[PDB]
Structures are given as structure tokens and as C-alpha cells.
Amino acid sequence: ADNLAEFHVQNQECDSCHTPDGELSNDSLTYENTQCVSCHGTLAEVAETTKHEHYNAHASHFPGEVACTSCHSAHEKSMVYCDSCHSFDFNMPYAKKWLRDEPTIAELAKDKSERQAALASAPHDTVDVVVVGSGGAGFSAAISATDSGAKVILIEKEPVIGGNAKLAAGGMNAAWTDQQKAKKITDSPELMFEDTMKGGQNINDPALVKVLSSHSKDSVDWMTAMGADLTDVGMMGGASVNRAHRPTGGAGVGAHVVQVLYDNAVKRNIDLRMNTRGIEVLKDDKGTVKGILVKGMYKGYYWVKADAVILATGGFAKNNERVAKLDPSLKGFISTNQPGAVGDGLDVAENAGGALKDMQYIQAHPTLSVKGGVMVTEAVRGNGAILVNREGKRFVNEITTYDKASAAILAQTGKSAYLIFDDSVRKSLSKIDKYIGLGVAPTADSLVKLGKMEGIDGKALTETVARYNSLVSSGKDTDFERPNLPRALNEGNYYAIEVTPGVHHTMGGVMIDTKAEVMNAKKQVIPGLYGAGEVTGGVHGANRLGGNAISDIITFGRLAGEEAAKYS
Ligand SMILES: Cc1cc2nc3c(=O)[nH]c(=O)nc-3n(C[C@H](O)[C@@H](O)[C@@H](O)COP(=O)(O)OP(=O)(O)OC[C@H]3O[C@@H](n4cnc5c(N)ncnc54)[C@H](O)[C@@H]3O)c2cc1C
Ligand code: HEM
Ligand code: HEM
Ligand code: HEM
Numbered sequence: 001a002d003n004l005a006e007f008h009v010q011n012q013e014c015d016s017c018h019t020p021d022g023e024l025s026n027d028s029l030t031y032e033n034t035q036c037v038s039c040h041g042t043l044a045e046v047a048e049t050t051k052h053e054h055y056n057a058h059a060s061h062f063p064g065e066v067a068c069t070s071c072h073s074a075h076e077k078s079m080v081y082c083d084s085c086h087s088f089d090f091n092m093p094y095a096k097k098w099l100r101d102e103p104t105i106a107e108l109a110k111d112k113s114e115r116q117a118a119l120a121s122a123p124h125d126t127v128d129v130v131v132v133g134s135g136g137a138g139f140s141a142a143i144s145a146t147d148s149g150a151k152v153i154l155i156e157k158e159p160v161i162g163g164n165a166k167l168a169a170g171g172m173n174a175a176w177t178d179q180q181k182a183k184k185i186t187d188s189p190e191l192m193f194e195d196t197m198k199g200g201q202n203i204n205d206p207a208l209v210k211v212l213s214s215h216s217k218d219s220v221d222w223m224t225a226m227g228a229d230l231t232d233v234g235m236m237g238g239a240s241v242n243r244a245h246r247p248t249g250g251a252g253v254g255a256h257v258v259q260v261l262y263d264n265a266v267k268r269n270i271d272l273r274m275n276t277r278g279i280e281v282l283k284d285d286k287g288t289v290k291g292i293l294v295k296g297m298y299k300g301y302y303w304v305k306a307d308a309v310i311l312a313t314g315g316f317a318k319n320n321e322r323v324a325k326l327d328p329s330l331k332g333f334i335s336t337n338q339p340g341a342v343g344d345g346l347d348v349a350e351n352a353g354g355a356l357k358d359m360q361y362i363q364a365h366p367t368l369s370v371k372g373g374v375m376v377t378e379a380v381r382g383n384g385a386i387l388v389n390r391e392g393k394r395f396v397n398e399i400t401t402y403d404k405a406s407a408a409i410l411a412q413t414g415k416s417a418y419l420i421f422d423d424s425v426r427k428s429l430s431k432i433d434k435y436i437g438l439g440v441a442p443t444a445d446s447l448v449k450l451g452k453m454e455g456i457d458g459k460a461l462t463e464t465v466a467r468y469n470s471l472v473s474s475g476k477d478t479d480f481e482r483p484n485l486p487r488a489l490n491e492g493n494y495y496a497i498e499v500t501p502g503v504h505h506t507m508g509g510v511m512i513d514t515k516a517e518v519m520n521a522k523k524q525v526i527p528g529l530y531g532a533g534e535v536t537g538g539v540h541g542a543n544r545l546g547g548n549a550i551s552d553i554i555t556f557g558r559l560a561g562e563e564a565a566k567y568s
């Protein structure tokens, strides 16, 4: 067979997969995926038949209920979504190589000729608020709005939910929480505010950072009441005390939070539409929002009439062409992001009259695995790992800022360095087991042997670890001044992870005020238009701190949803 439908129709009728009239049920292909499940079982049941020792196409870290048509199309060959970050050995039937080629918003001007017909028709739906983007900010705002009494529609252009939020690991920053108090930490919303401004080089909009620190415990309490586990509190760079919240034992904060928000949206019956891209905010004759034109992958262009639109589309760190224009030093780098984090949400905000700010500030994460091509959390350093170069020595404060850590790593022999840790660090952060499972953390029972495997000077590494361990025991790093030294590297075996920088987060974006209202260049509010999460600029200034983006999306998403509901 040349394609999946053709293979099944050898022994089955069209209506084994299609509705009685033959029309696609909707852009999520809800009915059609229920039929695949009907015969093959759920994703978990299919996963029992495709087991590999350390990976499985049908059992991954993605949260929510991943549709089969996310990877299996029927009438044409299709792509494995995992290939957008990994290169596992797969043999999916009727596959084609991963290639993302999505027209820009500007390029969709070519469809003028179908857009006008859509716009001339009656609205397909009439609701109170449309939320664009199913990352942390967008689910947070959809739930908030709905909880406040508004009818919402939540769209996602991708076939799967979660954006980049689902990939987060290190934590959700908050201060003065009950979770901190249980671990015996002393903190406050004023120290979180202070750490943040200093980390953002004082470019941050102070009124936005105040909302960030003052709503942070609240956001943590909100998530926990919805079912989240945020009781592990670790340390991340540039924080004066531990404040990075995550699930028990140090699992990834990201996939967990997005799974909780999806489960909660599903319980409120929120209208969630996959493969549906927001294209153009529609305004009436006095410039206030009246709706949005969307492009459904399977059903074409239609418009939704609504009083408010909340853009929660994330950043543009996957778009290296746009990144390179703004920061030529990052051209050619690999990204840590999902394939659709390209900035089209910014283009929608601009066409509507919204202004942008801080666009030149782009953050590179210092430690991508050279071997796996994926981020390795800064929490591995926060829980005690050191960085060593090929000569077997320390060369930087490992919990310094992302900008300084990336430059120091790049300055080393080979433009990369190695994370080095033991079983005491490994056991303190369960996320480390995921790196071991990926195959990217070689191990040996002595540093001499470990350096010999990885090409690190073995006897100098042995001396380096002995010297760091005596600094830990003393309480002060006089070589690099790392201010937190939580454990000696001396229990069980040793591990090394080869690491190097990659493009990660865009701190600039659309201009919002403290109610998350989008403004134009004259600082005038555009009525009915909201912005929340990494699509906005002004929260993180010139350098975001680890853990502060998950705090930002929950807080600002929640608030945009409440204000849109009230505006109405
Ligand atoms: C690998 C990784 C790990 C991270 N770890 C952490 C952490 O531990 N702590 C932390 O503080 N930060 C962390 N960050 C940053 C953090 O995850 C975020 O900045 C991201 O979660 C922001 O969430 P968001 O909701 O604003 O956007 P996203 O979660 O990216 O979601 C936005 C969504 O909008 C959808 N969309 C975009 N444009 C449109 C359009 N036109 N039409 C329809 N849908 C649209 C996108 O496809 C996407 O799904 C991490 C980021 C990455 C990549
Ligand atoms: C779009 C929906 C579906 C998806 C994604 C899907 C997935 C697949 C795939 C990947 C294969 C292997 C093809 C090959 O080996 O070349 C397959 C085969 C098969 N499918 Fe489907 N399927 C779908 C719908 C259905 C439905 C509705 C039925 C039953 C009426 C069905 C029953 C089968 C059977 C019987 C086989 C052959 C092997 C077996 O005995 O399980 N599938 N399917
Ligand atoms: C001869 C039998 C079939 C006919 C005439 C038929 C008809 C169609 C048509 C006309 C479309 C596009 C409609 C639109 O764009 O609005 C479509 C798409 C689709 N069909 Fe079929 N279909 C058949 C068999 C199947 C089978 C066997 C499956 C699953 C195994 C299936 C699953 C789908 C899905 C999932 C889509 C969405 C697009 C895609 O994945 O290709 N159909 N079908
Ligand atoms: C419940 C939903 C799904 C169904 C029913 C389905 C169906 C199937 C079937 C019947 C096979 C053939 C393997 C076998 O059992 O011999 C298969 C293989 C495969 N599917 Fe799916 N699939 C689903 C979802 C997905 C998703 C969401 C992805 C990607 C994220 C995906 C990617 C693959 C890959 C890569 C293979 C080949 C596996 C390997 O070489 O290990 N599938 N699928």
C-alpha cells in the first residue's frame, strides 16, 4: 500500500474510520481517532507491542492524550513527531522524514481569496473569550476564564498540547510558600523580586516583576489545589535561597504541570481544538476586538465571534532566522524548543496594533547534551554537579547566569564541557535518571576510568574532585565563588554528561500592562486583546532566571483569563 488508508481499505469500508456522512468531525479528528483506538487499543495498550529497552514511540514524556493522527495520517505518508528532537531507531509504517514547513502569517496573505469568503460568512462560533496556545499560560487563562463564568474556546496549532511548557524541568519559582516552610527554607516575595531584577540586569518592567513575585505563592496554591505536587524545593542559579518548586524527589515540573492543567480543562469540558492556528484578530469600527479568524488544518478557514482574544503563543527561540537577525552570535545554534515555537503569535499581535519590546534579548541555555541534542536541566548543577573541561578542571561558577555559563563553556577546549556528579547527586534529583535512560550519562566507579572513557584528563579530574570536596566541607568556593555547595561528590559511582549551549527563551515580545492588556506603541490599551507567557516582553528583562518562566506563565495566564472574563 502507498498509504495507511489504502492499506486498511483492502479489508474495511470507508466508514470503519469515517462518520456516517463522511465529513471530518472537527480539526482535532476526534471521531476518527476514536475509531483507531476502537481497534488498536489506547496509546498505552499500543505501547506494549512496540517496546524498546530505553524508548517507545507510544509511551513518552508528553502529557495529555496524544492523538494517533498526530503521527499517523491516513491518505498520505506522515512524520514521527519525536523526530523533531531525537533520532531514535523507528520503523513507522508509511513514514516520511521530519520536515517542518509552516507558512508565516505574512505568507498566508496568499489565501486572500478564501479568507474573504470566511469573513463574509456568519461566525462559525460565538463565545465570550478565545485563548490562542495550549502551553502553560493558555491552559491557565482558559481555566481561569471558565471558572469566572466565561465561555471559552482554546486553540492549538500543533497536533499535541503543551508547547515548550511541557519540557520544563528545574522548577517553578515562588516565595514564601507552605512548601518552603516544610523544608525549613526562609524566603519572601521581596527577595524573589530583588533576585529577579538583579538577574534581568534591571531592564525588567518593575510593575510586571511585582505581579510576578506577589502572585507567586498564590499561583503555587492554585496549581496545588488543582492537583499539582510542588513539594520538592531546589536551588537554581541567581536565587538567594531554594525556591524552585517541583514534584517529589526532583521530577520535571513541566510535563506535570501541563498534565494537571489539561486534566482540569477536560473536567470543565473546555472546548479545545487541535490543528487550529490563530491567524488574524478581528476588530470592529471603533478598534475593539470582535473575534478572530483561524485556519483549521482539516476544515479550512473560519472565524469565531468573541469579546476577547488572549494570545498565549510562546516565544520564537526555534526560529533561528529571526533569532539571528536580532542576535547574530546565535546563528547556527541548535534549539531546546518544540518545532512550532517560531513567533507567529507575535506577528498576530502586531497586525492587531500591539507593540513589541525587548526583542534583542535572547537567552541560550548553557547545557544541551552534545550526544542527545536536548536540554539537561540546570537543576543537575543546583543539586551539586560541577562542570569540568577536557583538561579535567573546574572553569566557572556552575550556577552563574545563563549568559556567563554559556560563554565560559564555549571558551573551553572543543566548545564543550562535562557535567560531573556522583550517586549522591543522582539520587537527590530523579530527573537525572532520564538522562541515564537517554544514554547520555556514561558512568564508571573511578574518575580515572571515567576520564579515560570520555577523553577527560583522568588524574587531573581525580585531583579536581578531591579539591572541590574539600571546598564543600569548608563551606566556601575560593576558586570560582559558587555560593551554594550542597554535597560532596563522593558516593558510589561517577557520571559525566558532555554539554554545550543552545537557543532557549525569548525574553522580549508583545507589550502588556499589569492586567495583561496588550498595548500599542503609544501605550494605549487595545480593548479586548490580552497577552500572557513567553509571547510577552518586560517580565524577564535582559536575562531570565531559572524557574521564573513557569512562575510567569501560570500567574499571567491566570490573570489574563480573569480580566478577559470581566471585560467580558
Ligand atoms: C526544554 C525547556 C525546559 C524549560 N524549563 C523551564 C523550567 O523548569 N522553569 C522555567 O521557569 N522555564 C523553563 N523553561 C521556559 C518555559 O518552559 C516557558 O518559557 C514556556 O513554558 C512558556 O510557556 P507559554 O505558555 O508562554 O508557551 P508555550 O508553552 O511554548 O506554549 C505556547 C503554545 O502556543 C501554540 N501556538 C503558537 N502560535 C500559535 C498560533 N498562531 N496558533 C495556534 N497555536 C499557537 C504553540 O504551538 C504552543 O503550543 C523551559 C523551556 C524549555 C524549552
Ligand atoms: C486512522 C486510524 C488508524 C490508525 C492510525 C491505525 C494504525 C495502524 C497501523 C500503523 C497499522 C500497520 C500497517 C502496516 O503494517 O502496513 C495498522 C494495521 C491494522 N489496522 Fe489500523 N489504524 C487505524 C484504524 C483502524 C481501524 C478503524 C481498524 C478496524 C476496522 C483497524 C484495524 C487494523 C488491522 C486489523 C490491522 C492489521 C494488523 C492487525 O491485525 O492488527 N485500524 N493500523
Ligand atoms: C475509500 C475509503 C475512504 C474514503 C472515500 C475517504 C474519504 C476521505 C476524504 C474525502 C477525506 C478528506 C476530507 C476533507 O478534507 O474534508 C478524508 C480524510 C481522512 N480520512 Fe478518509 N476516507 C476513506 C478511508 C479512510 C480510512 C480507511 C481511514 C483510516 C484508516 C480514514 C481516515 C481519515 C483521516 C484520519 C482523515 C484526515 C486526513 C488524513 O489523515 O489523511 N479514511 N477521507
Ligand atoms: C493510540 C494511538 C496510536 C495507534 C493506534 C497507533 C498504531 C500503531 C501501530 C499498529 C503500529 C505498528 C507497530 C506494531 O504494533 O507492530 C505503530 C507503530 C508506530 N507508531 Fe503508532 N499509533 C498511535 C499513535 C502514535 C503516535 C502518537 C506516534 C508518535 C508520537 C506514533 C508513532 C509510531 C511509530 C514511530 C511507530 C513504529 C515503532 C517502532 O519502530 O518502534 N504512533 N503505531
Ligand code: HEM
Pocket (backbone or CB within 6 Å): 054, 055, 056, 057, 058, 059, 060, 061, 062, 081, 082, 083, 084, 085, 086, 167, 169, 252, 336, 337, 338, 339, 374, 375, 434, 435, 437, 438
Ligand atoms: C512522542 C514523542 C517523544 C518520545 C517517545 C521521546 C522519547 C524520549 C526518551 C526515551 C527520553 C529519555 C528519558 C525518558 O525515558 O523519558 C527523552 C528525553 C527527552 N526528550 Fe523526548 N521524546 C519525544 C519527543 C520529544 C520532543 C519533540 C522534544 C523537544 C521538543 C523532546 C525533548 C526531550 C528532553 C528535553 C529530554 C530529556 C529528559 C527530560 O527532560 O525529561 N522529546 N525523550
Ligand SMILES: O=C(O)/C=C/C(=O)O
Pocket (backbone or CB within 6 Å): 168, 169, 170, 171, 376, 377, 378, 379, 545, 546, 547, 548, 549, 550
Ligand atoms: O531546567 C532548566 O535547566 C531550565 C530552567 C529554565 O529555563 O527556567
Ligand code: NA
Pocket (backbone or CB within 6 Å): 315, 506, 507, 508, 509, 533, 534, 535, 536, 537
Ligand atoms: Na518573551
